[PDB]
Symmetry: D3
Subunit: 307 residues, 6 copies
């Protein structure tokens, strides 16, 4: 168990074998629950910015494995919020209480920074600004493997705010660990996929391309990964991109392949019309449900050495 | 068990037998706790408006039966609060996590709407604007039965904001399912009992009347059900009714019958003077305590098929 | 077990034997956990002002002993916050639900007041304005005993905001129960140790003195107890004292004794430079960690009669 | 010239001869302007609450007579607004600068209070909370005399917020100084004409009556004086009366007498439909225009001894 | 005198002869002031949105001609601001007081609307949202004629926010009334010159072109008219254009013609570096100073029939 | 006339002869008004922070001499307030309109800075943060000369906030220009008279001393100059000094000399009890009234060359 007590900060820190281990464990737990695997563990749920899916799915997963939970959903009633306490001190103190810390924070690098102050307590990154979202990627991969039967040789389009989308940074890096995947990036110029991601793809000799509409790749993709504009992260010089520039409607799916799935880490705003919800391609709610198995798997592996 | 996996949205959806089943189960649990009845259940506590009694009594009840709890007490740190997510999407995602959803929301019909998006997950309405409050009614009935020995042939006065009082809408409908109850409604004209409630009573041939003071019915009632003006729900054209128009003081109880109990779903503001708290008639804190047994009963029946 | 079902409001209400019992129990639990001691207990975590350490350490302690937790971290989404409910009514209702109430409130005397409305439910004071903080004192004593091997015949300096520091009021009273302790108080004139504390020391014939710098006592102390200026409690006529008047830096420790420990109930603001964190004297994070054992001990003793 | 250097605070302080003198002077100025009557006077325009008509008509009148103006339209940038200065000190200082003070203030009695601090400088009350509005009354009388040819033996209805309407308090008192006027008061019960006004009418043996609609007096009135609900002055227990309870529409004028005029001190909100503006009865804009002649007259008489 | 009592709302309503009359009058007044031309006039200065140049230059001009001024610089202390009065009623009442109304309002068409309610009182448009600014254009033309000796056969570049720039809408229309002018428009795509302006130029057979930098027209222009991004008028989908896209620096003027002048209606933000202020081309402060003569001229012509 | 077109920024820039010229002119105008001295002048009243006395007395003085006034009492509705315009640009533009600028601004050095952008237009400093208030000093000197018959060989106490009191900085410098004055400074340590003032007194060999109560100098002073704590200028580390530390009551005047006058530039807050107002020593309202003659004098001298 390479994941035992491992900090889970960036997909960059995980190997393909690490990913495969989590996915296999998640599949096993989906089939055979272990209500007491983490009995007598107490885990911190430390959310410094808003969340519905990530926090509630993480906490549910903790309880499904028998662990207890303490924490907060915003910093306003913490001593950090009201008394001037630093994040470093906050983590140091919490790490004397709990067996693991799940943390979401608006600043890039906050989770990595937390590991410097958490002593021997594993930190799991539930999102650090626009940087990384490794556990979203674990459930995304689980979902892709479940619907496509594999994680290699896929055609994957990512649409929307790729600049600020921590979801796509992690997912692109993860898929780049498998053979022969092909990427299509569709974003406003201002919210393009960051150069550092593209450079990584080039170093690996991975094929990718840019496009100005969903329509021009619709016939070719196995996975259409839609994203929300990260409104709360935008620089003022980017506010013209607040409205979704690419909106998916049911009619846009006319030439989609039979195996194609529309994914979306959620929440969605204007980028997916609700009429998509009724097509066989809509898979974002199934995807969200898979967060339970992916996160149970990760918690079990990080907190229980014996496989 | 007719309640197994049933959505609990409106008293209108429940039969008298349903009510009797919950009450009998609540009495049984009051006498013989079952700390593990709901072991391995995880329940969502989804509160979109303020609550003390309803949320904490519901969560306590969950723990008393061995269930775990995830959720929120306000929408501000959810993706609905900060990222523009719809309520429908919120429920859809939460329903992939938990075994039941307890939900309170400021908009009439929100709980019913949630059932359209919760898939196979039971929704329990902890209050939907000024509409329904079925679990308050369950504990009210439990309390009335406990102090009066029956739910039929009672004289019941309801006082205060009957227009916006979801408590009295549900309770009136429930009591209308039993034989021979007599209702006295005492409210400002602007906050009168809604016509749809009155029409229902007329269809059943149930006796009711309107009055302009507590004093004129005090000698006749078995139950005096006081309510708070629903200040946060009032239309501007109703702000003159913010102050309690009927205030109960200990001296007003001089001609009360020996069996008479003052109920109040709470919280109270100005409508009950604290000197009432010392009289044998004051029963609102006992009533609140009965929320534990009523809500345990409901949870047990909804989530465990075998009686 | 003298602590069984005892309200824990003020150090004034506890005897030296009471304190010794908690400390011995805490040491025992540190060595031999009891994951099921409080199984089937449900405890209220009722926080009406901000907290990181106190609330999370208390809740963790509850879970470590197998108890469940319900409550809130601020009053904003309670009926007290939104519907005008009194604190008295709030406590009365919560006390019908839970087996104990842990409460922090911004008003001096609030915890004592709560005991008047909690019926047969024990109230544990997690801080009542600038008055008392008994559980901070329990962990402080545990920490002092752990590093000094005793609680008598010590030289203890307290620095910073002693007027509003509920931490030092409780700790001074506790240490005054043991033989031969010597106190050094270092505070701005405006935030001096309250006269009522000093009078108590005089009645017991306890030696104490005032000083205008850390340096003048550094060579003599076993414990340097630093505090944060209670900014949110200051009268406007005291705002000049918001900035720490005594700042501890690593260089100030040049003549500290080898056994000397720097304590701080935390959070800290400007009063301890982070370079202190690396010296052998820094013990505030260890101190915070001891909150788990002290609070487990207190919960176990209050809620389980059999030792 | 009885008005020379007279404080103009309440209609109560003026005699019928005083009123007649202002009106005759206003008529004369309407016919023959005196651009230099007040040359070398400087007058303070001191407005502590909002105004369009009163302030701009007063200042225009000052300039039409050759006077200069200094002052403010709100207290926010005065030392009273930002530095904690009392109203008394404010008036004392301003009275060392100017030849007269025109003052509007939200508190009843403020203008009277100002006269205690203004030394030998005349104060003219442009409205003091819900109390008096003497200069509105002067222009109202001018307008009534202009359209009816007299101020005696009229039938005058006043409609709307009579409780808080400083306009109607002053106007009723003024009209009560002439022979044989008959009053009809039409107001919500909560905003009825104050008892002190009614008592005055009774002492003089003046006929008045209350009515619950405009329609029931429409055929009989010479003057229909409409008013705005004084929203910014209402007690919370009066907020149900924010919406106009009596709305005048053109169709309501079907049985109005040929000489009947609709007056309104303005601003109007919902109480007069704009279709009234086109009928021969609409006279509120003419009325507002007469503020120039009435206020010129008052200024000329107060500030220039020689008639 | 074609301008006598004329509403001055849009440049569209003025002829080339009208413009020439104002300019000739302005030149004459610049050379020979008439301190008493408008003695005994009172003019309203009615500003419903912010202004430095327009309001103060207009009021100064009024005083230079001997007129008096009443009004407001924001609507907050008017009855429109605090009592719910409509703009229409506001204008109707003010028009009974004054001899002319100068009005600036945030809504396009507000000045035109005012003329419907001002009776026989001339309205002068000091800016109506993003629509028209006729008096800015009068001073611009005066300034162009002063520096170029003519208003025909010029090369004029307009730069910045041409969509929301009421300044350039009026100025383009005015210059289109003279022979042979050539326009260069340099704007972000989102803030391009409105189609209705361009269509007008096409109808007249006027040469114009679009460009993406100042540099590409610098060598050819007689007038470089810079503008501020109208931040307070931008739609959210335009917020990316808040920062000036074209910034003029002294070094950019290296190939400017000797007669070239940089104009800017002001205020400027980031679009003109202060090092331009020292070059012979900088003429925006001279331009602002010419507002006095242009506005005196307009006031004199509108309010005094005899030339 | 050395003052003709002179910028009036700091008392430091004026000679004793300059001061004597203003005072003699003020006395002459007090005795013989000149209603047309400044006819055809237009002056800017540019107030960027709150004022009652300074702005209204300045504007009154302008009108008393026949000048007109344009300006603003706060920056909120200027283009500086709403459109991002710099102060420099604001002054540059205003200086093309008016014959002089009276300016008050919250930032030290703002008036001096304005002179760099005002071209040939004189700037008169009505207060620049905590720095200078030259026109307050002119009226103070006028008042001292009026009550003491001289400006030399006086005993003058200054009390309150001397650090932030622009009033006392200017007044101390002015009095230091005359022979043999003796100063007593009474202030909280935190708000002591600035060192740069004290150094100036030392360079001139002027006697001064510090005291901790009004009482210890009461018997010796000719002038008791009280001041308000400059609350809006205080650093947070000074907020303990918000309440007046020295409060003057009528009883404190028991041993005052018969010629002693209490001055206060006003507004006052808590530092002078209103019972002082009735004693012969109270002279602050007379002092404020003298602002008219001092400011008329200054305006006349600055704007009219011929004496």
């Amino acid at each position: 168990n390479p994941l035992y007590q491992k900090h889970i900060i960036s997909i960059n820190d995980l190997s393909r074998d690490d990913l495969n281990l989590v996915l296999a464990t998640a599949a096993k737990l989906k089939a055979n629950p272990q209500p007491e695997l983490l009995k007598h563990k107490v885990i911190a749920s430390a959310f410094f910015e808003a969340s519905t899916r990530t926090r509630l799915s993480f906490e549910t997963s903790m309880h499904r494995l028998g662990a207890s939970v303490v924490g907060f959903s915003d910093s306003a009633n913490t001593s950090l919020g009201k008394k001037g306490e630093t994040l470093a001190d906050t983590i140091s103190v919490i790490s004397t209480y709990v067996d693991a810390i799940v943390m979401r924070h608006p600043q890039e690098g906050a989770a990595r920074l937390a590991t410097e102050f958490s002593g021997n307590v594993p930190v799991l990154n539930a999102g650090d600004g626009s940087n990384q979202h490794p556990t979203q990627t674990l459930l995304d991969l689980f979902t892709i493997q479940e619907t496509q039967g594999r994680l290699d040789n896929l055609h994957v389009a990512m649409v929307g705010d790729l600049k600020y989308g921590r979801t796509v940074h992690s997912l692109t890096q993860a898929l780049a660990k498998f053979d022969g995947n092909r990427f299509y990036f569709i974003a406003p110029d201002a919210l393009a996929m960051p150069q550092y991601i593209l450079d990584m793809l080039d170093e690996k000799g991975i094929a990718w391309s840019l496009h100005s509409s969903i329509e021009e790749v619709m016939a070719e993709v196995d996975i259409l990964y839609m994203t929300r504009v990260q409104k709360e992260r935008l620089d003022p010089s980017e506010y013209c991109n607040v409205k979704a520039q690419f909106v998916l409607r049911a009619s846009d799916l006319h030439n989609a392949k039979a195996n194609m799935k529309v994914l979306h880490p959620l929440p969605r705003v204007d980028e997916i019309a609700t009429d998509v919800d009724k097509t066989p391609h809509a898979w974002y709610f199934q995807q969200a449900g898979n967060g339970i198995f992916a996160r149970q798997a990760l918690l079990a592996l990080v907190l229980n050495r014996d496989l």
